[PDB]
């Protein structure tokens, strides 16, 4: 098999090999993994957990 390319939670684009992205468990519930790409972090875009629905940086 092959491997899956991670995707930003806010905008849905793929993460490039060496960009300044981040990922962490949901602060509210801890059941899902949030990914944020460099552009979304720079512009402070909001994000929403797909399980518990808690939103925002």
């Amino acid at each position: 098999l092959k491997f899956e390319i991670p995707v930003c939670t806010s905008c849905g684009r793929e993460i490039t090999p060496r960009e300044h992205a981040t990922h962490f468990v949901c602060p509210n519930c801890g059941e899902a993994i949030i990914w944020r790409c460099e552009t979304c972090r720079l512009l402070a875009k909001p994000y929403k957990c797909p399980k518990c629905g808690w939103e925002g940086p």
Binding site: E14, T16, P17
Partner: protein
Amino acid sequence: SQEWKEYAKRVLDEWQPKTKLGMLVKEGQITDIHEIFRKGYQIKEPEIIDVLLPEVNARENQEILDIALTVRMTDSGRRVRFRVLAAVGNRDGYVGLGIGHGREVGIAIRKAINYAKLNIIEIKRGCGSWECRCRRPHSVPFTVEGKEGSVRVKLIPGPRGLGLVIGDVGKKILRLAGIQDVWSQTLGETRTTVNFAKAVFNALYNTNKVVVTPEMIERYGIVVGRAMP
């Protein structure tokens, strides 16, 4: 692959890691090259590439792109410095480019090879030519661009067996990445070798920035990293 496996084994057992990612590699929690990318890690120890991609230490997988000597003026004469531009790769899907400086040529060559490893990237390969639709990863999957200084580079998919229709620096870099056929167009001062090489490297990196659909992956035979038969 028998030699470089034991080289990687030798390096691993006598290495004391100074960084968190180096520790993850030392303890067997990371076993593949593709697992160090796309998560924001800082890569600061060259032993990481030596363990995960040992074949970048072969002579056929390293190229010295150019050597220049530069001068600083002083009241006691001219102080001379060497600048070396070099590149490494695995001829499948990983490539890196680096610059080194030193008082003698050998020091600069060592440092330049060292910095190329630390600047490693993974790319995408495929077949996108109107006159060759073979779904094999011998070319770029679609047209891409890169730039540095006054230099602009555009890379275009080409038919199997065409060769690399590009200047020599671009030839060396593309060969180290595992690409056999391409067409190209350039603007600016290509005789500035540092900028020419950086523009080609940026163009290769930019294959990751194009948005694609699952259907496209089948149509162009897109492969990320190793071809993996």
